[PDB]
Structure formats: structure tokens, C-alpha cells
Design a protein around this ligand. Structure first.
Ligand code: NAG
Lengths: 171, 53
């Protein structure tokens, strides 16, 4: 999208991730793992819902209106009734087409945004202890077991602990 | 339905405080009374759709 993450520098999506919209896959000494990020998944879902609720909201109630069909040719007044209804329908048809186009463009951009935001948050956590591999993966230059990965995921990672090790392995 | 003759229908609305007056030297088809007028959500539609519960 507009941030270049989804369909971006992130090659493709994971059909295998069924418990969230965004997550982590990791590989370390102990093995490989996958976990969903529920906060950012929620951010996306919340926005999309907000919008969904804006649009799906209560319709307007109308009761007695002008007649829209006619069995006889009457000339002027019927011309006018017909023209008014046709005008209305064209304008609302326009509103709807556009609503959808804009809203959709924005949904695509905001979901891309959420992805990119998670990436950025993580990179910032890792400090000097990892490098951006450009594929949406970080290379972590110290020894990271499942607990450590977890600490990265739940936001508690303390970089200063591993900084010496990592700094050493980076250079 | 048998006739070459016709009846033309007309209506008059009379607000409270006003008065109706009917004057005819003949040909008049006279009202028998009045229909109450209400305002509200009522309307009319042309449809062949069955009504259902
Ligand atoms: C994050 O993970 C660590 C290690 O698994 C755990 O001890 C800690 O409680 C977690 N932090 C939070 C706030 O969930």
C-alpha cells in the first residue's frame, strides 16, 4: 500500500496464521515458532469496524413520496417528477460508488500502516542487537531462546543485557 | 357498464372555523357527510406481491 509493507518489502501473507492479522515467526536454537500480535490485529479490526458502523448505520425512514411510475402520458408535470427522481438516483449512485472507492483505498492503506507500525516498534526495541534484513525479518546477533523471543513479542525485551554479545557478533 | 353518461368527482377541504356552502340548480351529486383528515406516516403502493405473516 502506501507504506510499502504489505505486498511490499514483506513478500506475502501467511495462510498459516489463523489466530490473528499480524504476527511473528521466529527461528532460534530451540526451533521455529509462530505467534499472533493481538494488539495491532485489534487496532486494524477496531478501525475497520468503526468505519463499518459508520456506513451500515440506520437508514432513513420515508413514507409518502412522489409517484415514480406512470401508466399514461401526461407531459410536463410527469416530465418533472421523472426528472427529479432520476436526478436523485444518479446523485446517490455517485455517492455510493465514491464512498466505496475511498473507504477501500483507506482500508488497504491503514492495514498496511498497522503492519509497518508493528515492524517499526519491534526494530526500535531491538536497538543495536539486530539488523533489518529487508524482507521484514530481523537478524538477531545474540543468542535468543523462546523466552527471549517472547520478551520481544510482549514488549519487555531488555537490549542492554544482550548488547555486548550482539555488538560483538555484529562486528 | 351500460351508460353513455358520467359523473365527475370533486373534493373540498374545510378547516375548523370555516364553513361549507353548496349551491345547485341541479346535476349535483351531493356529499353525505365528511371524511376525517389525519396527518401521519400513511401512504399507498401499487404491488401484486402477496402479503405474508
Ligand atoms: C513477557 O515475557 C516474559 C518471559 O516470558 C514474562 O516473564 C513477562 O511476564 C511477560 N510480560 C508481560 C507484561 O506479559
Amino acid at each position: 500500500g502506501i507504506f510499502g509493507a504489505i505486498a511490499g518489502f514483506i513478500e506475502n501473507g501467511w495462510e498459516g496464521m489463523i489466530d490473528g492479522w499480524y504476527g511473528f515467526r521466529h527461528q532460534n536454537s530451540e526451533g521455529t515458532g509462530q505467534a499472533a500480535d493481538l494488539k495491532s490485529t485489534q487496532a486494524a479490526i477496531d478501525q475497520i469496524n468503526g468505519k463499518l458502523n459508520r456506513v451500515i448505520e440506520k437508514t432513513n425512514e420515508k413514507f409518502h413520496q412522489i409517484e415514480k411510475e406512470f401508466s399514461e402520458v401526461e407531459g410536463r408535470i410527469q416530465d418533472l417528477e421523472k426528472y427529479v427522481e432520476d436526478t436523485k438516483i444518479d446523485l446517490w449512485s455517485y455517492n455510493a460508488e465514491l464512498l466505496v472507492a475511498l473507504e477501500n483505498q483507506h482500508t488497504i492503506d491503514l492495514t498496511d500502516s498497522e503492519m509497518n507500525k508493528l515492524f517499526e516498534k519491534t526494530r526500535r526495541q531491538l536497538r543495536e542487537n539486530a539488523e533489518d534484513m529487508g524482507n521484514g525479518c530481523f537478524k538477531i546477533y545474540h543468542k535468543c531462546d523462546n523466552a527471549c523471543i517472547g520478551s520481544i513479542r510482549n514488549g519487555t525485551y531488555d537490549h542492554d543485557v544482550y548488547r555486548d554479545e550482539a555488538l560483538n557478533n555484529r562486528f | 357498464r351500460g351508460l353513455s353518461s358520467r359523473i365527475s368527482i370533486y373534493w373540498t377541504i374545510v378547516k375548523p372555523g370555516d364553513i361549507l356552502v353548496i349551491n345547485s340548480n341541479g346535476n349535483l351529486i351531493a356529499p353525505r357527510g365528511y371524511f376525517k383528515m389525519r396527518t401521519g406516516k400513511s401512504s399507498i403502493m401499487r404491488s401484486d406481491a402477496p402479503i405474508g405473516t
